[PDB]
C-alpha cells in the first residue's frame, strides 16, 4: 500500500509557510494567501522512486495550548520549522516551536528540518552560518528555500520524509 506521511509546517506568521506548501501542491508561487487559513493538503509524489502520499498541514493563526490543539499537532510525523532569512525575529522564535514540538511528541527525537525561506531576497539579516549552527545544535538538517523560485522546496519536504523513514 501507499504510505502516507503527515508533515506539519510551523513558524512565525509571514515567513512563507503557505507559499512553500502551495509551491509543493500547485507548482506555482502564490504571493498572497490569507494568513489566517490553517489547512491540510495532500499530494502524491515520487521520492526515491517510491510513490507516497504527503499530507501537509500548513499552520496558521493564534498560539493556543489547549488539549485539542496539542492533539492536532501531535498527528504530525515530521515538522518543518521555517524562518525567513530577512527576519531576525522569526529566527529567534525557532527554539519556541522546537520546544513545543518536543513537548507534544514527548520525544527529543522528532523528525524535523530547519528551513530558511526567502533565499531569493537580498535583504538578509540571518547569516547562513548561524542557521547552519542552530541546525547542528539540534542535530537536524538545514535547507535554504525560496517559495518564489522553488529553490530547496523538494529538498525540504523530501528530506523530512527521509527523516521519518529513518525514525521508523
Ligand atoms: C513564538 C511565539 O509565537 C507564536 C505565535 C504563533 N504560534 C506559536 C506556536 N508555538 O508552537 C506552535 C505550534 C503550532 C508548533 C507545533 C507544536 C504545537 S503544540 C501547540 N499547542 C501549538 C500551538 N499553538 C504548536 N505555534 N508561537 C512567541 C513566543 C512565546 C510567546 N509568543 C508571542
Ligand atoms: N520573495 C519572497 N517572498 C516570499 C517567499 N515566501 C513567501 N513570501 C512572501 O511572504 C509573505 C508571507 O507569505 P505567506 O506564505 O503568507 O506566509 P505564512 O504566514 O508563513 O503562511 C507574502 O507577502 C509572500 O508573498 C519567498 O520565498 N520569497
Ligand atoms: Mg499562511
Swiss-Prot record:
Effect of residue 62 to R: In a colorectal cancer sample; somatic mutation; promotes interaction with SHOC2 and PP1C
Known outcome of mutating residue 15 to I: In NS3; affects activity and impairs responsiveness to GTPase activating proteins; characterized by a strong increase of both intrinsic and guanine nucleotide exchanged factor-catalyzed nucleotide exchange leading to an increased level of the activated state
Result when mutating residue 39 to A: Decreased interaction with MAPKAP1/SIN1
GO molecular function, one term: GTP binding
InterPro entries cross-referenced by the UniProt entry: P-loop_NTPase, Small_GTP-bd, Small_GTPase, Small_GTPase_Ras-type
Group of enzyme by EC: hydrolase
One Gene Ontology cellular component: cytoplasmic side of plasma membrane
Entry's EC annotation: 3.6.5.2
Known outcome of mutating residue 13 to S: In GASC and JMML; also found in lung carcinoma; somatic mutation
Activity regulation (record text): Alternates between an inactive form bound to GDP and an active form bound to GTP. Activated by a guanine nucleotide-exchange factor (GEF) and inactivated by a GTPase-activating protein (GAP). Interaction with SOS1 promotes exchange of bound GDP to GTP.
Record: disease: Leukemia, acute myelogenous: A subtype of acute leukemia, a cancer of the white blood cells. AML is a malignant disease of bone marrow characterized by maturational arrest of hematopoietic precursors at an early stage of development. Clonal expansion of myeloid blasts occurs in bone marrow, blood, and other tissue. Myelogenous leukemias develop from changes in cells that normally produce neutrophils, basophils, eosinophils and monocytes.
Designated name of the protein: GTPase KRas
Organism annotation: Homo sapiens (Human)
Designated gene of the protein: KRAS
Amino acid at each position: 500500500g501507499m504510505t502516507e506521511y503527515k508533515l506539519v509546517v510551523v513558524g512565525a506568521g509571514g515567513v512563507g509557510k503557505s507559499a512553500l506548501t502551495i509551491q509543493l501542491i500547485q507548482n506555482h508561487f502564490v504571493d498572497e494567501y490569507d494568513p489566517t487559513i490553517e489547512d491540510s493538503y495532500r499530494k502524491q509524489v515520487v521520492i526515491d522512486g517510491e510513490t507516497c502520499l504527503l499530507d501537509i498541514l500548513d499552520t496558521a493563526g493564534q498560539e493556543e495550548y489547549s488539549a485539542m490543539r496539542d492533539q492536532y499537532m501531535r498527528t504530525g510525523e515530521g515538522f518543518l520549522c521555517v524562518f525567513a532569512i530577512n527576519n531576525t525575529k522569526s529566527f529567534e522564535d525557532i527554539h519556541h516551536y522546537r520546544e513545543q514540538i518536543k513537548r507534544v511528541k514527548d520525544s527529543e527525537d522528532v523528525p524535523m528540518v530547519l528551513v530558511g525561506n526567502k533565499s531569493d531576497l537580498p535583504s538578509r539579516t540571518v547569516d547562513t552560518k548561524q542557521a547552519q549552527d542552530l541546525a547542528r545544535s539540534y542535530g537536524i538538517p538545514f535547507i535554504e528555500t525560496s517559495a518564489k523560485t522553488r529553490q530547496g522546496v523538494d529538498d525540504a519536504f523530501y528530506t523530512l520524509v527521509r527523516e521519518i523513514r529513518k525514525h521508523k
